[PDB]
A = this chain, B = another copy of it.
Amino acid sequence: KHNMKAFLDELKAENIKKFLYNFTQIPHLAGTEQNFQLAKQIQSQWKEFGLDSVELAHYDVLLSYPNKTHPNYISIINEDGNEIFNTSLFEPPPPGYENVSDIVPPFSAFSPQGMPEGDLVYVNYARTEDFFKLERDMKINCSGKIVIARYGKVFRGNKVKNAQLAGAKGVILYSDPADYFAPGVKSYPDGWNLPGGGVQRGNILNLNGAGDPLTPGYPANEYAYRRGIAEAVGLPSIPVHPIGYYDAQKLLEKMGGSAPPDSSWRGSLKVPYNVGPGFTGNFSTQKVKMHIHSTNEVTRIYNVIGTLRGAVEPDRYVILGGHRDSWVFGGIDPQSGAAVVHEIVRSFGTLKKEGWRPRRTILFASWDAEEFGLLGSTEWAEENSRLLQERGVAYINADSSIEGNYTLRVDCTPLMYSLVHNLTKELKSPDEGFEGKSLYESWTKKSPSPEFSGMPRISKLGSGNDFEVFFQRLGIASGRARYTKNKFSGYPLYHSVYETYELVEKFYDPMFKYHLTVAQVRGGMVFELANSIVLPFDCRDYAVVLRKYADKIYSISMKHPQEMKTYSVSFDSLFSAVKNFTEIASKFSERLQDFDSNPIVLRMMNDQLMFLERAFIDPLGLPDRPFYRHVIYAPSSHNKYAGESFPGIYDALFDIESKVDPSKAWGEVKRQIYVAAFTVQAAAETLSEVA
């Protein structure tokens, strides 16, 4: 038979291993020849695996690279202008790769050029609350200073935006062993920890969903009109550079000024973690100088797009997509995900060669330039937006399959909760001590739902990966699943040269059983979405969370009872809309279970299910973020990686006691309540009887 069991059984750990090795021997940096070569390889292989068509979709987008003959570095300089300490020009390469060419040195992609010289201020994780503490409580002024911040907790672009708004003239990002060195584990190559010379690469844009900085709204095709650099979206205005903790120790050890305000500001290095500004006593005339010479350059990128046409509903698309570009070897990120997609394509292709086709069309994507701001997925979605918003059933992401070996981690729309629960109850746990038990059992034991007994945790979607355009801009039901550790900081070797095939094979997943489990979850979800007669979405699950999010946002507002009285701030309309949504969803579910042999009522009903996520889209977008259009979820304004619920109301309430015109500020809270209540009611009404 050709059923999901046949599909799942065809998936093999040893194939995933072979593909991971094949994808991680040389760097595949976006915009480079090596990455174009890999795209062509994947195109050829997906064709041989059996897909109906496989094309490259290319775009010319703004990328950023260091200057090969003018390297980036940071100095401590003395009063004579002598550079008495310099940060490293590259990470010591791992064993047997010391002769690999074209390893990009650590840099912060999209940093402007400059050579700012100044006094250091240490800003902890450079979160909004860290700057509140510095400025409001400690009365420390970052204006004109170079800020040094540890990576972790929030997206690095948010740190840079916060530093810029504080008036910093430069940012140094570093990996503290508190966040990137697990106790009792050895440094690479002898374990999975970050060595003192390791450095986390990464872009520091604040695109808010725009895609290529030069072409917001439209694909960066051959005839595209581009913005000038001065009008580009999301570029930082101050130079930024990342360093390892050997180098950070040398910069932090001389810091003077104020003591850290409490222990949550101290990492694990042998330094005081003084906030500054500047250095102690004897060293007070020394300064820190950055030298950044990176350049932004419009560069061609290539997505691979494979199609497996549906037998019955070819105009309905289920998309499995993940990126192919890496900072260096991409041993975990992304090739652990890409190897899993490759094996899934191979398995679907085996069924296809035997005469099977899925009910709906499946699209498979190998995205480029994810590391530079989700550029490949976003430009392709911009080109194909009309097809996607009228035909897109679901998007399943497929970046890194593993970031640990402890349990499953799922983030998805409530529409997919029931699907994920049911699928994981049918899959074997790969976990030690859970032999013969289901993946649902192990996952629920290790990652209990904070709310419900006997259920697992499922998180919200924010951004920071290629699902963002599909979910937050276009309102296509989206999900992701991976194996994880015992949350937003990354595993120790993230975006470092040390993220290799050997890291995975030796320390993460020697038997490739966790990769196999993730292939079963991702592939199983795609199989069900593409083959179930009735789409496997339960609208009642959205009703449950909407009540939770309404209670949450009301509770935030209720910290300000006098203002709610003064400005007549009522959440009655939002609770009414949520109650209505609950009532209508329950009635829709009854009809879905009861409806008649009638394929128009079925597709009528399938279209109601498909367009339900779409109904949470507001075509006017969120305030000052036109490409974040989903009213229930958006990436947090303080941390792109985190999802925020009822983001328009949340941002209107955030730090509201600090606003100078409370009438105006509470007016905007009321406007956001109106928008949210209207959107929930309008989404509910899409599930009413159609006529």
Contact = CB atoms under 8 A, between A and B. Distances in A.
Interface of A: 52, 217-219, 221, 223-225, 307, 309-310, 312-315, 317, 361, 383-387, 390-391, 572-573, 599-600, 603-604, 607-608, 611, 614-615, 618-620, 626, 667, 670-671, 673-675, 677-678, 682-683, 685-686, 690-691
A218 B674 contact: yes
Given A603-B603, A686-B386, A691 B221 contact: no
Contacts of A315: 604, 607-608, 690-691
Given A315-B607, A386-B682, A691 B310 contact: yes
Contacts of A626: 620
B225 A670 contact: yes
Nearest to A218: B678
B314 A217 contact: no
Contacts of A600: 312-313, 599, 603
Contact of A619 (B224, B619, B671, B686): B619
Contacts of A690: 314-315, 361, 391
A627 to B, nearest CB: 10
Contacts of A667: 225
Contacts of A221: 678
Contacts of A675: 218, 225
Contacts of A217: 618-620
Contacts of A611: 386, 390
A691 B218 contact: no
Nearest to A215: B674
A620 B691 CA distance: 31
Q: Which of A218, A383, A618, A671 has the most CB of B within 10 A?
A: A218
Contacts of A683: 386
A461 B604 CA distance: 31
A306 to B, nearest CB: 11
Contact of A691 (B307, B384, B603, B607): B307
Q: How many copies does the complex hold?
A: 2
Given A600-B312, A626-B620, A686 B223 contact: no
B614 A390 contact: yes
Contacts of A317: 691
Given A218-B674, A218-B678, A223-B573, 16 more contacts: A217-B620, A223-B572, A223-B674, A224-B674, A225-B667, A309-B691, A361-B691, A383-B682, A386-B611, A386-B614, A386-B615, A386-B682, A386-B685, A390-B686, A599-B600, A600-B603
A269 to B, nearest CB: 48
B314 A677 contact: no
Closest 3 CB pairs of A and B: A315-B690, A223-B573, A225-B674
A18 B619 CA distance: 44
A601 B133 CA distance: 62
Contacts of A312: 600
9 contacts: A217-B620, A224-B674, A225-B673, A312-B600, A386-B611, A386-B614, A599-B599, A600-B603, A620-B626
Contact of A671 (B225, B384, B615, B674): B225
Nearest to A689: B314
Nearest to A308: B691
Most buried by B among A307, A390, A619, A677: A619
A218 B314 CA distance: 35
A612 B2 CA distance: 36
A223 to B, nearest CB: 4
Contacts of A619: 217, 385, 619
B691 A219 contact: no
A683 B385 CA distance: 10
A686 B315 CA distance: 10
Nearest to A674: B225
Contacts of A223: 572-573, 674, 677
A424 to B, nearest CB: 29
A682 to B, nearest CB: 6
Contacts of A670: 225
A222 B581 CA distance: 18
A671 B391 CA distance: 28
A686 B387 CA distance: 6
Nearest to A53: B691
Q: Which of A600, A603, A604 has the most CB of B within 10 A?
A: A600
Given A315-B690, A391-B690, A690-B314, A678 B386 contact: no
B387 A685 contact: yes
Contacts of A313: 600, 604
A667 B690 CA distance: 46
Contacts of A615: 386
A607 B606 CA distance: 14
B691 A314 contact: yes
A599 B224 CA distance: 39
A222 to B, nearest CB: 8
B314 A604 contact: yes
A672 to B, nearest CB: 8
Nearest to A223: B573
Contacts of A674: 218, 223-225
Nearest to A310: B691
Contacts of A572: 223
Contacts of A608: 315
A309 B391 CA distance: 25
Contacts of A224: 674
A10 B148 CA distance: 82
A673 B618 CA distance: 27
A387 B572 CA distance: 25
Q: Which of A573, A675, A682, A685 has the most CB of B within 10 A?
A: A682
Contacts of A307: 691
